[model samples]
Target chain A: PNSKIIIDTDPGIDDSVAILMAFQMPGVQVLGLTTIFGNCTTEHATRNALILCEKASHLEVPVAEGSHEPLKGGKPHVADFVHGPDGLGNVDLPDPTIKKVEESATDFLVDKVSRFPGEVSVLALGPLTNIALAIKKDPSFVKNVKKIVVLGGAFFAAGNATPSAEANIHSDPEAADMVFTSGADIYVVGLNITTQVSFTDKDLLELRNSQGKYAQFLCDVCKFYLDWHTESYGAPVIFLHDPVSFAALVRPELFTFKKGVVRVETQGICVGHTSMDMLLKKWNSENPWTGYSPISVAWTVDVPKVVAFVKELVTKP
Target chain B: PNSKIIIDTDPGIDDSVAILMAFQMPGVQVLGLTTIFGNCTTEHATRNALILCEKASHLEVPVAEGSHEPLKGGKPHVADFVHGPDGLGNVDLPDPTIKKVEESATDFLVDKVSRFPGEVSVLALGPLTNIALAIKKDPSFVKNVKKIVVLGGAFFAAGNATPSAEANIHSDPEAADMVFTSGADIYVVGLNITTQVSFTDKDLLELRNSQGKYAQFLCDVCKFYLDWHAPVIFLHDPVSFAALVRPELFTFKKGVVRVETQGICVGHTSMDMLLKKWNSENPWTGYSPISVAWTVDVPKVVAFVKELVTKP
Candidate 1:
């Protein structure tokens, strides 16, 4: 069984590990990579995509830049603290020789899925701009794609950007609006699930001791990423935010999902905020569309299975 | 006799007319114009204030810009069609020479009223941004302000924005939140009362014939503005809008007032949006700081010469 996948990403440090893990996995065809503005500017994100592709030895696949900013006013990027100023965890990676494809990301995304029909599985790991623009440009874009596996929006977890907003979706709310209302089969691997699947010290030590170069590199990335967690939350491990989206796509049984129609708040002191139609008394009574459309939000995850799967994939290649 | 009043406005064509009329009235003193972003952008509204000041020959008083945008986002500006792109009945006027005051409109308002004690009256003619900001900055700002008379929000009338959300209050609800919570004497001169006051073509021709420069200019403004109203429903007239503010200036009665602040359809709808605490459902049964406009002196407003002379 072959799964055709297009990874829309920002290629942060964890993204590199996720890309390597995906390339190593069997029965999953790496169709292409599409970079968008999230952890950094679109330009930087595109650069990271090229470098990650080169590192993964998948140079033939095309990479393209998505929207420069959100549909509304531009929001400032906070990549300096999280993804490092270079957006590749300051790894000092070499410049890429591959140039981005000529077609705009919105058109490329729509055309790819339309040509493949229901075979295309979108692993959207960054801001949902290109996907949103594609959906808005053609509402039927959702029908062509097999499934949309995204990593953003927190259901029961605290947010990195704001109390009710996630960084990727918050950066481009109108785009998120387009995606949410696209009527696609979406599997949202939000922080609620991802924050629970951190690479523990035992997992890192095992990876560092493994036989493969990719495994050793992932261990190094974990060390640097885990430092902030150790200081802030007194945790010795760091969660791989992006990779969890791919994990959910490949292994849906590892996570729990809740369904509801989520309302995106474009106006208010809290811009880019998402208010779900929970059966809570305050919301269920007010929102008429609570039971109309279904939006799957991941609430928990099988951390050991996810870690083992990634470790096994890295060790294999 | 001196009447100190702060005109919190966006300087819409009607707001500009109201300011000019207030300035001309010997009984009223035009203290200053505190402009907010409503009918137009705060920058444009502030510029309108200075231009109006030049027209009224009162360049000494200061104009102030309040909020630049709404508290929330998403809604588009409708002033282009309603007030025209220029915001003042599409009539070209000279640029504003008087500069905006250094202090923010909110700070200026709170400070002025604090100094005046209980003598200051606020005449709001736009979104409640400046008033709300004043309350936020100084919780006691309302304590000093004797009364607040505003011209926004609808009561027993259709909303121009959302079905339930009135344009001005709905524009920046946080600002409205600030005003409602501040516990002050408030007079909401909404569409409920103003829509009742309509103008006629006969009144326009009479003003053009009787009053020379000022009245002819006003009649011309009415001619362009009255087009908004049809052959039946009178044009958007401020004759009563302005008259309601000066109730003493007219013969008016006061009654216990209440305002609505919650619910799906009733929040900010202002069809008497204010529910008498005794009249509302549970949960909101006791919440009662909002301005309740219970008193309306119908005879005073109807019999007043200014309201009758200035036909809508």
Candidate 2:
């Protein structure tokens, strides 16, 4: 069954693989690419999206640009020590040759979800800014979309941004709060599970042995990204961060689930902290807890299966 | 050379004497009596004002009823515990037969000050609700009125209301803040000084012997009032108006002042809280630096002042 998806992304080098993973799958229809500020500026991300799409000769999908900054103020960039200047692991790509669909990312999201109704699955690989804006503008979209699988927030693990805040959610917690309370059927892909499903030296060699130039480009980017992770950890492997989201969408059987209420921090010195509903008694309370269900939080993945699946698709002639 | 003044008051028994003292003084002109909520409800205070005015029938003063509550919330009242249920030491004088003017106390203040710009000194002897409301309604009233002499806030003494918050200001700090910043020249008859001027049993005996019916009533009220002031601490009496308008009646010195701004328990707490200007290091910045210019010599006030000066 083909899953209709609007990929909201920032196309960091990992984001490129995540997008390709979605495109390569048999029945995953690429509805559009909406870029937001996270790994880089939305401008840079939008440009990266078009370049990636152009390289793959997949320009049919519209690219919508998102917000320039978070709702409240903060610096918005991946730690430059990690994603480098271009956010594509410093393997600098060409400028976007394709034009963006003039409708802003927020408008594009609203239009796409409205037009498609319950047919659109939003796979968010960056900060949930554009999607959150859409929810705020039209709250009914909560019931309108099929599902929103967000790659932000941490349940019981350390965060990439701060002690309790993840990169995307930390970028704009006000947006995250709006999205959480929008009453949407949501699935959160957090760092707890994704950080553990990594790529070893063996996975890199498999990418090098693949047939397509896309696969080779993926390997080159991974190699560049892995060097930083390797230097930081003195380890021989790096996390396959972005593909985990696509894997969950492609094969739901591989991930576990948990249902819990979540809240986002918007004020004070410690901004962007996502606090999960840890009150078991309150969860059992009489708010009629309808439409609000637990997030299909993937705690552990069948990494062997994921790695084999990626090897087969990218290496296939 | 009588100083014309409007007493916007909530008459406690002590306030009753303050009114009588103002009326007896040869040069003091009582413009009118405006009652507000303080020691009792506005209705009760109005009744007290009318009753007191009738008791001192020699001075035919027009009495007006003011606001029933504070501007933001409800006005707080202290019942018979301190001032007694009648608000005039439960003396039970003639019922309020004096006709009350229809205007609210706030409107009366604004109109009175506007009509006689810089001539009407406002003597506020209760919670400053009406005056605070007037200042908010008409910003220019502050400049038009000669001066606002309020008997509230303590600079150095412990409070009567709570450990830190003063009674009158705490009842409505928002109003207090509004009035202080209203840009009017103000004289705070704060408890820090008022607590120093005590009215003893001897003073009551003096009132009984010299003055007749009014003096006997004042003496009776003081005997009860002074009983509460144990060990006969010198009563911090309301002699600010008497001393100010007639410098011969008292001696004084001026000092800078500041009122507490924040803290849930310490709202409107006045102090010599600020020691320097542009205090880059201190916390109590932006508080009111009141200029306390006088203190009454108790001996002089007790000795030479006539019965008419201390009685209704």
Best by lDDT: 2
lDDT of 1 by residue, B166-232 (tens): 5677667656655654668866665555656555565556566664325655665555567654542
lDDT of 1 by residue, A187-265 (tens): 8877777878777788778777778757766666566667656655666777888777888989889888877666555
Q: In candidate 1, which residue ranges exceed 4 Å CA deviation?
A: A73-78, A279-292, B1-312
lDDT of 2 by residue, A1-317 (tens): 67789999987878888888777777888989999878777777888888888887888988988888877756675544566677777677667778999898888888878888898999988888888888878776777899988888766554556533578888888888777767688888888778777788987887787685488788877877788777756788877777888777777687877666666666542356554543332221233222344455565677778777766766655
Give the worst 10-residue stretch by lDDT in candidate 2 chain A: A281-290
Candidate 1, position B106, lDDT:
84
Number of the top DockQ candidate: 1
- Model 2: DockQ vs. true structure: 0.01
Error of 2 at B66 (Å): 50
Clashes (backbone N, CA, C under 3 Å), per candidate, total 12, 12
Candidate 2: where is the Cα deviation over 4 Å? A73-75, A282-294, B1-312
